[PDB]
Design an enzyme around this catalytic site. Structure first.
Site, short mmCIF file in Angstrom:
data_model
loop_
_atom_site.label_atom_id
_atom_site.label_comp_id
_atom_site.label_asym_id
_atom_site.label_seq_id
_atom_site.Cartn_x
_atom_site.Cartn_y
_atom_site.Cartn_z
N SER B 16 0.85 -1.18 0.00
CA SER B 16 0.00 0.00 0.00
C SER B 16 0.89 1.24 0.00
CB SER B 16 -0.93 0.00 1.21
OG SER B 16 -1.84 1.09 1.16
N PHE B 83 -7.17 7.62 4.20
CA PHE B 83 -8.12 6.87 3.40
C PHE B 83 -7.65 5.43 3.18
CE2 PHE B 83 -10.84 6.24 -0.44
CZ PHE B 83 -12.04 6.55 0.17
N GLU B 84 -6.82 5.22 2.15
CA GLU B 84 -6.44 3.86 1.78
C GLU B 84 -5.61 3.19 2.87
OE1 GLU B 84 -4.79 3.07 -2.33
OE2 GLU B 84 -3.56 1.69 -1.14
N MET B 85 -4.79 3.97 3.58
CA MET B 85 -3.96 3.38 4.63
C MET B 85 -4.82 2.90 5.80
SD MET B 85 -0.97 5.22 6.84
CE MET B 85 -2.10 5.59 8.18
N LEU B 86 -5.84 3.67 6.17
CA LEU B 86 -6.69 3.28 7.29
C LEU B 86 -7.59 2.10 6.95
CD1 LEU B 86 -7.70 6.79 8.68
CD2 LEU B 86 -5.71 5.36 9.21
#
EC number: 3.2.2.6
Lengths: 309, 309
Positions: B16, B83-86
């Site tokens: 990611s 966003f994508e990390m969480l």
């Protein structure tokens, strides 16, 4: 100086302590606060001898603006650290930073503490805790997913493929219908009364003894049949976003709903009698053309028929 | 050396990264891992140009044994950190310690990281991440409570007191019936088909246009009427405890259910048209005598009539 308390609050602070070890220490902190003017809730004094149950405790926590945790070396061994103390800890870090007042004794230090308490900035040092007494949505994935699983999916999915094949057999849908239940997940989380409300080309065709059967036409005029419905629980996130009182905005609506999506898929694929029984259809609900939703579903139905071949 | 992957897993690691900043760094880490033998999922290579949506990402995370987070100073500014990390971060600390592989660049250090990533023990230093690739229930309160609120309580409670008073009026229950809906919360979280299944002295008396009305007799023979039902969502925790596959045992069943109890009460008391409209009845469901449950309910009904006077 001493703040006026809100509707649920009747105490400035609830002193949570292990009665086996730090009862003396908790009385000392209590006497220090109550003299300054604050009103506190103290188990020994306020809880009647026969009513020291967990719900009376949570009733006290609900009415306490702050919760003071008396955390000693013995407090961690007492199971109180694994029970009554964790009841005061909330899923929201914003809530714990406002409400919780961790009081560390004997030099346990912050690193020794459980993960939730560590980043909370903990604490005659009794003046500092008075300073903290003077004057939010957690993760929804697991509650939504486990509740949707055991309350519904775990009940209907294990034998649903048999029900679908029986309906498919006696309705001449052979080769034009997947065994799976298609679960619709619009990105906005807005659920409609029927997935057929997305296009007049999606036709009600009856139901399964009740899950609904629809039809959809591809480019060749071939009708494809499917059992389908919305994942109803996601509508809650839409309602929370639209509510001004609720602390959920658009970006968190997407994050929460992808955590829910991921958690539900971990549970379903872990269960051998539920995996491969449903297909979650995530899509951007942004299109009005009568062809858009029919073409998406036909694509998913054909994809699932490949895997079932 | 290289582990064999389970049923959902088709990749050893999902990388990611923020495509705006650390695309070069992510390729470097990718090439380091894939040469050693591991199979990875890389957005630039594996995600088709038009399908880089959040659900394809979560589909990749679901199929990845580990998730490698490329966290740089720029990664935090990019909204990718919001966003994508969480999406890769889970409510369970046990899950994050096993799955997540935080790769820190530029000396951001652990303390700079968000609260969930800090206690996770993060990381030609590329040998160390290969070491981590080689070879659980979160908090249920908020999902249960908000789902029970917006899916049910928020709908029926605001005008229920009017419905109850109308039923009470035309049935001669004046003075012998509270306005509130009594919600039953057995400590074991076992819900029965009807609260009247707890004692033959609890009698079905009809329903509200559907919430059920029961009667209960006190010591003087006076009948007291109430609308009552179980909080159905708590039964999920009983099912999770009884399931050997599910990571929930008795102590967590109590902790989870008191967090749920507390969160539901915060939401209801925050909403002025829902507070004082229901009464949650928590009780130890341990007694078989025909007098036990009737005497508990009569006590609660009389307590609520005092407050409504």
């Amino acid at each position: 100086s001493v703040p006026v308390l809100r509707h649920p609050h009747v105490y400035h602070a609830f002193i949570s302590y292990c009665a086996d070890a730090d009862t003396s220490h908790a009385r000392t902190i209590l006497d220090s606060v109550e003299s300054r003017g604050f009103t506190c809730c103290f188990a020994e004094r306020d809880f009647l001898p026969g009513e020291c149950t967990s719900d009376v405790v949570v009733d006290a926590i609900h009415c306490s603006k702050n919760v003071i945790l008396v955390i000693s070396p013995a407090s961690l061994q007492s199971e109180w650290s694994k029970f009554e103390m964790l009841m005061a800890v909330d899923d929201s870090h914003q809530r714990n930073n406002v409400c919780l007042v961790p009081v560390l004794l004997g030099g346990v230090k912050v690193d020794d503490l459980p993960p939730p308490l560590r980043p909370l900035t903990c604490i005659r040092n009794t003046d500092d805790i008075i300073q903290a007494i003077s004057k939010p949505v957690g993760n929804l994935a697991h509650g939504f997913a486990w509740g949707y699983y055991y309350g519904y999916l775990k009940i209907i999915l294990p034998d649903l493929d048999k029900t679908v094949r029986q309906w498919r057999r006696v309705n001449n849908a052979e080769g034009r219908m997947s065994e799976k239940l298609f679960l619709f997940f619009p990105q906005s989380c807005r659920c409609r009364d029927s997935i057929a409300d997305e296009s007049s080309l999606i036709k009600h065709r009856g139901h399964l003894p009740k899950n609904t059967i629809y039809s959809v036409t591809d480019d060749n005029g071939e009708d494809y049949f499917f059992a389908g419905e919305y994942i109803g629980v996601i509508h809650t996130m839409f309602e929370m976003e639209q509510n001004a009182t609720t602390g959920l905005q658009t970006r968190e609506k997407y994050v929460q709903s992808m955590r829910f999506y991921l958690t539900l898929k971990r549970i379903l694929d872990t269960d051998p009698e539920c995996s491969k029984k449903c297909k979650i259809v995530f899509y951007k609900d942004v299109n009005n053309s009568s062809d858009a939703m029919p073409r998406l579903i036909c694509n998913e139905i054909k994809n699932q028929l490949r895997k079932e071949s």
